[PDB]
Amino acid sequence: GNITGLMQLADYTYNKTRKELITAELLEIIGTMTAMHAGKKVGLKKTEFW
């Protein structure tokens, strides 16, 4: 009973840490993509206004 009570908590924190490390890697990648979007410039958009 005790071993099971520890095993469920261990599996839970294992999956918690797994999901948090996945979310973290995702937010790193999205931060970098966003920084690159900021690095890229806007164009001119020249057209007739009259």
Binding site: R18, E25, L26, I29, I30, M33
Partner: protein, 526 residues
């Protein structure tokens, strides 16, 4: 030739194009021939289009020779490779270029058959391994994954499944002969050379072609190697032939797709992959099928290999391919190291095709091995490391695992009788050490034929044309049953009398090593 535009920038293997003033429409997945020089040409492919006018392009050859300002011509046609029976003997390049060593065109991306163009799987594909052919049988049209860490036996399993098909396809007609297509993605060129030399040594390349996209090759060529292999399998499907298709491996194909998608600024996702990498592998594996009798009854089987890391299965790609495939095989390093080779984990390994692939002689055998191993685990798991257990379940299971341990494939006739003896208890009095020597004497030698016991009209283990009666009638049939029992009983008595007595008397120093080497050579040849 009329061009579409000119190169604008390159990022390693990736390129980009800027269209000319004469704005001409370009399709989405066609081929672009770039004129890097006056003679040499760099083939390429369109991968995306943009509002302002630009073309992201993957380059399939001569990347170093690319420079800005070059002309860029268009084909107006999808990618296609040479196709036919004039390719089974030769290594190739996924562009069809034959690789050296010391007409008909087919599309790389075709839609898979619908349900009406298919048939439920009914015939087996013999890997030659008792492990696979008993408990998780492989059918034709049955895509089945191979997982495991590094250096477990994945390539060896997928290559012995090819070597087994040389003895048979020579004999049988060329309509039911399952051929094969190995596909190496990102593997070392010396591994490819050793595979070439091995299949040439065993004459297995007559029924086996190879698709090579090495680590030095472009990411787009590693991306399109499995499509080339599948396209080769598709003419066999439409011509009724049977064909196998191996991928070593898809994790590198997905790394290459990641490289492509990130360099072309596609939106990333889990493990930095895009969203449609599940759809990428579904474009490929779903092309495997068991076609309909309205469609030649051909078939394409698949054995995709995928390397795990620290026995992880929660990974994205592993999760996806398991969600796609019609079963799986799972190799373990903790068992590979423990003398268990092939180091399967039978509980995690699954074949949803349980019996419809198996033969009449095979259903009884594999069902007995299931009803033996499900109990062997409940017993072996609870017993200590030091307890002695004298029970038919633990005995038959240990001897069965010994028989499951073997280098290289095994003939069907060889695979059945050695397990029939276990399931019916004939292989109980022998020792756990001498099981493979028992098997070597049963199959290759013939003890009753040597020692005069010839009270058996037809049943002997030297003809090897008897398995074609075993597959049809089955050993449980009344004419084959008693002769089988008599041959096995007489072989067992001759063994236990002549050999098992001499064995235990070898209480020397070099004799025990000469015997250990004998048993570990019998394990290899059998």
């Amino acid at each position: 030739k009329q061009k579409i535009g000119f190169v604008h920038g390159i990022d390693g293997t990736i390129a980009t194009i800027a269209p000319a003033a004469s704005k001409v429409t370009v399709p989405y997945n066609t081929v672009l021939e770039i004129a890097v020089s006056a003679t040499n040409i760099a083939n390429a492919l369109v991968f995306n289009l943009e509002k302002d006018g630009s073309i992201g392009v993957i380059l399939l050859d001569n990347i170093s020779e690319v420079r800005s300002g070059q002309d860029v011509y268009a084909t107006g046609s999808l990618l296609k490779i040479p196709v036919g029976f004039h390719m089974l003997g030769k290594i190739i390049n996924p562009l069809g270029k034959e690789i050296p060593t010391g007409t008909k065109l087919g599309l790389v991306e075709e839609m898979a058959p619908n349900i009406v163009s298919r048939q439920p799987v009914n015939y087996n594909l013999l890997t030659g391994y008792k492990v696979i052919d008993t408990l998780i049988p492989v059918g034709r049209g049955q895509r089945e994954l191979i997982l495991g860490d590094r250096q477990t036996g994945k390539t060896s399993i997928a290559l012995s499944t090819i070597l087994n098909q040389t003895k048979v396809n020579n004999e049988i007609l060329s309509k039911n002969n399952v051929l094969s297509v190995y596909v190496s993605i990102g593997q070392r060129c010396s591994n490819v050379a050793r595979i070439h030399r091995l299949l040439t040594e065993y004459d297995a390349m007559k029924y086996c072609t190879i698709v090579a996209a090495t680590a030095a090759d472009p990411a787009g060529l590693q991306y399109l190697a499995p499509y080339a292999g599948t396209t080769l399998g598709e003419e066999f499907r439409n011509s009724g032939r049977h064909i196998l298709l191996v991928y070593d491996d898809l994790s590198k194909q997905a790394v290459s797709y990641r490289q492509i998608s990130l360099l072309l600024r596609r939106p990333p996702g889990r493990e930095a992959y895009p969203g449609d990498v599940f759809y990428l592998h579904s474009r490929l594996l779903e092309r495997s099928a068991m076609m309909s009798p309205q469609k030649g009854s051909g078939s394409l089987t698949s054995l995709p290999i995928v390397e795990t890391l620290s026995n992880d299965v929660t990974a994205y790609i592993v999760t996806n391919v398991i969600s796609i495939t019609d079963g799986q095989i799972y190799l373990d390093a903790k068992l590979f190291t423990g003398g268990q080779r092939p180091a399967v984990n039978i509980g995690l390994s699954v074949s949803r095709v349980g019996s419809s692939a198996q033969n009449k002689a095979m259903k009884k055998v594999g069902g007995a091995l299931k009803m033996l191993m499900g109990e062997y685990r409940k017993m072996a798991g609870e017993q200590t490391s030091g307890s002695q257990n004298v029970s038919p379940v633990m005995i038959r299971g240990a001897r069965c695992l010994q028989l499951f341990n073997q280098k290289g494939p095994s003939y069907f006739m060889d695979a059945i009788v050695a397990l029939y003896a276990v399931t019916n208890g004939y292989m109980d009095d022998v020792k756990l050490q001498y099981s493979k020597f028992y098997e070597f004497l049963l199959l290759n030698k013939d003890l009753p034929v040597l020692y005069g016991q010839v009270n058996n009209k037809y049943f002997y283990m030297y003809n090897k044309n008897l398995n074609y009666f075993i597959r049809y009638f089955g050993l449980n049939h009344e004419i084959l049953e008693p002769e089988l029992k008599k041959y096995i009983e007489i072989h067992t008595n001759l063994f236990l009398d002549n050999y098992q007595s001499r064995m235990n008397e070898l209480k020397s120093d070099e004799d025990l090593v000469q015997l250990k080497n004998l048993l570990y050579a019998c394990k290899r040849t059998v």
